[PDB]
Design a protein around this ligand. Structure first.
Ligand code: D06
Ligand code: D06
Lengths: 823, 824
């Protein structure tokens, strides 16, 4: 009747102006806290950070003062580090390597997106333009009051120098990756030295060193393949643990180059579900320097026995690094089903020089002490899957050798991620490293002396995707981030790692916080917001008696950032299996109760993402507000398989992706229809990108009477065509889950898609190297065979995401027109 | 105006599917073998390729032509017993599938074959191997089908372009891995003759026509058997010769097109010369081999021109054609410069070729050795201000020395393709083949003794795309096809090459004929049809006294083939510049005068094609009849630039592609509006594929108030992305025609496209290796930048043309829906 609200129909030009009007920069992040060391001065700290003032991301600093009036709020000035410097390459065009890493990192912003910092010398090291640059501030060099030009580091290399890092033991040196091999150089003398020789004169050249391969980067959130030893030994020797990789047996596929006029593709090693991942191993590279800084010698070392024989079950190296004294290297290992993890200590003496000579090799093997061996200090096991959590803090071995104390984030134990203090017993069995042997199961398993829960409950410690802990050893406290208060807000917490009792929250409720702690534990920064309020960045001092450190009171010190949008509203309901799901609704603008409005169910719905939480959405999800301003109801549901709710909630997806997610979405939709008076269930569109697109198609397949149209972007339509890392973890290998692979692949159910045109819009970025355009291509193929209608939009200069603003606007205008006309 | 406007009934998608499904629910490549039995009842056996209607694929067949008749319908007899020539699920090798595209070959099975008349030996490609069978001559005529014999090989990969050695049928040749091979069919012995091949580090090949030669110059071979054997050496060895083209693609651009193995997610590399970019480096080489009495291949030799091809013929960019004289005294080549405005017919004496050696010293000796009188002879040179179309007619007569008499099809002389008899004088200047040689502007240009026009007038002899002449030397008559009667019909004519007087037509008017003439000139076949009648295939016997062979009467001997569709109507009109253009209309079925109907202007409009002529359109253009049955008027105009109207008609395109054609189309549309009163000019849609998609986009760009919607398929949107052969011929090099490349490139005029959605539907095959998907991908890129709506349909398992019926049906269903919903 007249109850049905009708969206105003605009011309295309009209829609373009509306979208253009709606859209007519990244808050400080990546901080370094530095104490001044000057009682006379008016500043206690200098805070260094990356940020973008109201053009490009750049290195910046603020001065933290010694006293504030406290009658008024103090706003800190963003001072430029560099004087009129452009870090973005000309026309924002990066090399294939640098552009692919921005993709893997989901980096949109231009300029300096990472940097290294050496505290003692005040040395900053970073990629800029298509080269390497550096500058010095603080420490022995002293604190500038105005910007200084960064100095380009000269190289006789060709191609980009990737993943640069300062030597922690000696800031005269630094490392980088050039043409799939490891290099080192001395900033002070300009001397360059290559340490690995896996690359030659690229189906022909399949070996690399120091490099994280595609799946490692896309599916394991590791972007480096090497790790500086934190100390030197005495000439003086320096060390680098590194992953050596061989992709020969890995499948090659071709994706189109951004240079469209060239009409060429790029080749990738793409391990599709069910076939070979690269062959990998951990190696060690040494090099000696004299007192003048000259690189005297270098050496390539390998495990005394093959890595494949020592660790037969290991499929991926998730993480690596060293103990703080440089005693032991360490590596986090994973099996192919991703159900068994191992933290392993590799003592350096375990590694011997590589040589072609079998005699020399046996001499080096005989020489290795019998008491040197791998130590498997930890092992996590599960029936679902092992999420890679990044927390692992080895304490120095003060209580002598033969034991190792560390903190560890474990989720498999109780089903949620919590902190544990662990003491593993290192007891050398004694080995004949000269004779080869095949180690069995639990061959290097350390007995666990003790294992204490530091945190517990129906909630999780944040330990993935940049989340970290801060451990103060004087006070025996561990600072961390979590959902203890609620799954919709991230908060900062402190708890004793000595006496695991009271967890104390340091962040204010109502808001979700992104925090950085000073290494001196005297102050932290919180970048936070709510659904109703734009984000701010405040500086908090921890004040109180030094005899009660757990109860330091965080006191607001200063602010670094502050602030036709209508915020959405968070709600919750329970499913017909009594599971609590959260949701979000954008109500139509100028709502008139009694009207039923057309509705857009905006969806993602896969693992590792939570859309519904209490933080500001107006930046990333402006289009959803735009839809609301035209008078659409917009509904977002976080169904089972979504994250921040523990393994068992996420685990509802196991081996049946596509099957569980829509029900929760349909439940949520029906709930919203009762609660809020304003949903017309006769006019409901489903729409998402990536996992969201896959689900938009499943929604139309399985629930055609509920969803009138689907707008599906960048979808995965054939699970056999997706990679190993992601697919096998949640769906098993295809040989072991034909039912799920088939039931979850939308391209194989195309008969179930509609006979009515205008109900399915497909969208996909032609350059997509993650969800290959093949997915859309194969779906149309099958749509054609089944005699089904479709509409299609291509983004020819876009990969998985749309990043060019004009393409984005076109995307939003198209979406508005499709809905206007056909919903 | 409400009642007047006819409204197409709007169907559901499934309804449209049933309509397309309901709607969709000949002999060629002949050999006339004379049967030499007086008592028998059959004068000849006629061998040919054909698809029986019951049969799934093309196959080698035969009919028996009887001695006397009393309406005879001849049986199609199977040559091969229950043989599948199509490989599994019609899946050819990349090499054979790309050659099928280049040849525009739709049908499955045996698409070509070689035949040696004396031995009665047939040689052809089948499965993914080579097959052969024997019939007639010394073998004898079979009465029942015979299983074909496979030819075993040590080679790996496909054996392409098989040809029987004319001088000795025991031998045959083929291309394996970009090199020329020969083999003795009787002994099964194989022998490789070139070594250009050993991916992108292997750019040399031999005996092979490269992409552009194939796609743009209608040559599918790069080797040519010498037709006569030789008998020179120490002790009784027999020498056989093959002329061939060596090619070096090094400096030619590489592009990647996706593989038909979609699930592989890979591409193929292609040497694709874009306009203005480098073509392969070329030369002509000679390969000889010697055989003993037992048919063993004793030796082989790689030979080459005593002087570089690039110094002897410095202006030559493309080898259009080549071959040998019938006595094997000279090899010949047709050459073309890069602008394709200068052609040369050149005779290459075999003695002009010396064995190839890396040794500097040996080459000098062999060069010195070459006789001083030996040289190339440029017997013909053709020049023009427009472009040289390549004409296949060149018939050298046997010599009876010091001159060469030949027939030539020439278009540049008068502006129309006509037959000429030419006598060129061969007089040797004398050259030191040892010294370096740099030639003058007319170094080997033979004087022309005489040059006679055998045909003349405002009409053309057919000399391209399979058209050819037949020359009977006893009677002095040349037989050919032409548009002399009218440009809408192909007819068979006979004129004397001895005495150029009366041209006699042998085909019946009212139809367009495709004819094959017997080598004995006693019998001929015509495959013909009209706009209103489906094709037929009749056998005609030439009769009359031998006193006046020019005046032999064709007499119907027998038929090989006989016979809601409503044919279209041909019409003609005159432009405001007083040019006569032909058109075609399909009237809406069950038309009610006074109604105004929505109209589809179906277009192509590019050179080398003519849509409007008097022949059956029902097979190829069924969809246009389906449109008419729904109530659309469908119009087709042959505007300036189209073919079979001579060079100057075609020449109006020159360096302004996209600029002239639409005017002729619009004139044509408005004309049809006045004559027939059933066209609603407020509802006109433009649609075509290939050149027609390019024009559909130009129609909407330049005439947005004339065309409400455009449906463009496989279009070229940026001329810079297109190849050298086609583009440079009609549009010059990009550095010499920046205005025209820019005005003719639809992707650069995207601002001019509409602001209203549902006015433009773009279609393109993902696997297109001719008009790369890039073109559409680039237009979408530009559309997005300009903020312009578009719809788009991809054919993922399809190159330039849609061949999977499942996809074809979907394409039509999509078209009807687009028209129904958005044409208003
Ligand atoms: N490899 C995955 C991917 O990009 N996918 C695309 C896609 C599209 C359709 C169906 C499934 C998939 C999986 C990504 C793994 C990391 C995850 N991040 C979110 C916040 C931090 C970690 C996002 C997904
Ligand atoms: N290479 C050309 C082609 O395929 N083109 C596609 C296309 C699309 C848009 C704009 C221009 C072009 C040119 C074809 C050359 C051979 C010719 N044949 C017709 C009958 C016998 C010869 C047809 C054209």
């Amino acid at each position: 009747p007249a109850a049905r609200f009708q969206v105003q129909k605009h011309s295309w030009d009209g829609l373009r102006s509306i979208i253009h009007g709606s859209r007519k920069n990244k808050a400080p992040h990546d901080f370094q806290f530095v104490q001044k060391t000057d009682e006379s001065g008016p500043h206690s700290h200098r805070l260094y950070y990356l940020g973008m003032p109201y053009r490009e991301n750049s290195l910046l600093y603020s001065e933290i003062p010694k006293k504030v009036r406290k009658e008024a709020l103090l706003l800190l000035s963003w001072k430029q580090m560099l004087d009129h410097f452009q870090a973005t390459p000309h026309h924002g065009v990066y090399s294939r390597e640098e552009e692919l890493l921005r993709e893997r990192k989901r980096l949109g912003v231009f300029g300096i997106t990472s940097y290294d910092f050496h505290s003692e010398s005040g040395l900053f090291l970073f990629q800029a333009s298509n080269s390497l640059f550096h500058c010095r501030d603080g420490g022995k060099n002293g604190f500038m009051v105005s910007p200084m030009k960064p100095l380009e580091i000269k190289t006789q290399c060709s191609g980009p120098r990737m993943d640069p890092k300062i030597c922690p033991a000696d800031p005269a040196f630094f490392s980088f990756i050039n043409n799939s091999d490891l290099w080192v150089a001395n900033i002070e003398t300009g001397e360059e030295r290559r340490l690995t020789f896996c690359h030659q004169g690229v189906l022909d050249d399949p070996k690399s060193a120091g490099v994280a391969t595609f799946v490692i980067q896309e599916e394991f959130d590791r972007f480096t393949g090497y790790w500086w030893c934190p100390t030197a030994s005495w000439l003086k020797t320096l060390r680098i643990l590194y992953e050596e990789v061989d992709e020969s047996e890995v499948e090659v596929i071709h994706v189109p180059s951004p240079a469209l006029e060239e009409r060429k593709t790029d080749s990738y090693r793409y391990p599709r579900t069910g076939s070979k991942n690269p062959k990998i191993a951990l190696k060690l590279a040494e090099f000696q320097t004299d007192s003048q800084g000259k690189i005297v010698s270098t050496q390539e070392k390998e495990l005394v026995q093959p890595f494949s024989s020592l660790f037969p079950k290991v499929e991926y190296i998730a993480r690596a690094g060293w103990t703080r004294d440089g005693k032991y290297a360490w590596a986090m290992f994973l099996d192919r089903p991703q159900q068994w993890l191992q933290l392993v200590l590799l003592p350096p003496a375990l590694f011997i020089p590589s040589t072609e000579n079998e005699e020399q090799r046996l001499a080096s093997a005989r020489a290795v002490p019998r008491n040197v061996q791998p130590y498997v200090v930890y092992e996590e096991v599960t029936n679902v899957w092992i999420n890679v959590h990044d927390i692992f803090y080895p304490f120095p071995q003060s209580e002598g050798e033969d034991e190792l104390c560390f903190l560890r984030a474990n989720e498999c134990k109780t089903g949620f991620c919590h902190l544990y203090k662990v003491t593993a017993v290192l007891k050398s069995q004694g080995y004949d490293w000269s004779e080869p042997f095949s180690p069995g199961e639990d061959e290097f398993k350390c007995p666990i002396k003790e294992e204490i829960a530091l945190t517990s409950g129906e909630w999780e410690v944040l330990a993935r995707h940049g989340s970290k802990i801060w451990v103060n050893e004087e006070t025996k406290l561990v600072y961390f981030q979590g959902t203890k208060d609620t799954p919709l807000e991230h908060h900062l917490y402190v708890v004793s790692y000595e006496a695991a009792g009271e967890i104390v929250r340091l962040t204010t409720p109502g808001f979700s916080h992104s925090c950085s702690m000073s290494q001196n534990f005297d102050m932290f920064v919180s970048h936070y917001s709510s659904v109703s309020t734009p984000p701010c960045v405040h500086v908090y001092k921890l004040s109180g008696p030094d005899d009660d450190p757990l109860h330091k009171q965080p006191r607001f010190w200063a602010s670094m950032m502050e602030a036709d949008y209508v915020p959405p509203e968070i709600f919750h309901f329970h499913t017909r299996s009594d599971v609590r799901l959260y949701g979000m609704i954008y109500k139509p603008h100028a709502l008139q109760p009694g009207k039923k409005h057309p509705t857009v169910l905006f969806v993602y719905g896969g693992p590792q993402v939570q859309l519904v939480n209490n933080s500001f959405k107006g930046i990333k999800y402006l289009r959803l507000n735009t839809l609301a301003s035209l008078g659409y109801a917009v509904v977002v549901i976080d169904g089972r398989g979504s994250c921040q709710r523990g393994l068992r909630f996420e685990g509802a997806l196991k081996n049946q992706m596509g099957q569980v997610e829509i029900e929760d979405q349909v439940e949520g939709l029906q709930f919203v229809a009762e609660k809020y008076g304003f949903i017309d269930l006769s006019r409901v569109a489903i729409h998402g990108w990536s996992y969201g697109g896959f689900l938009s198609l499943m929604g139309l397949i399985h629930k055609p009477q509920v969803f009138k149209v689907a707008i599906a972007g960048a979808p995965v339509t054939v699970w056999m065509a997706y990679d190993t890392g992601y697919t096998e973890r949640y769906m098993d290998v295809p040989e072991n889950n034909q039912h799920g692979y088939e039931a979850g692949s939308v391209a194989l159910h195309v008969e179930k898609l509609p006979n009515e045109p205008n109900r399915l819009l497909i969208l996909h970025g032609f350059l997509d190297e993650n969800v290959h355009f093949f997915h859309t291509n194969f779906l149309v193929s099958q749509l054609i065979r089944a005699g089904k209608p479709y509409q299609l939009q291509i983004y020819p200069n876009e990969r998985h995401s749309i990043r060019c603003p004009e393409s984005g606007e076109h995307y939003e205008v198209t979406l508005l027109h499709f809905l206007q006309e056909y919903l």
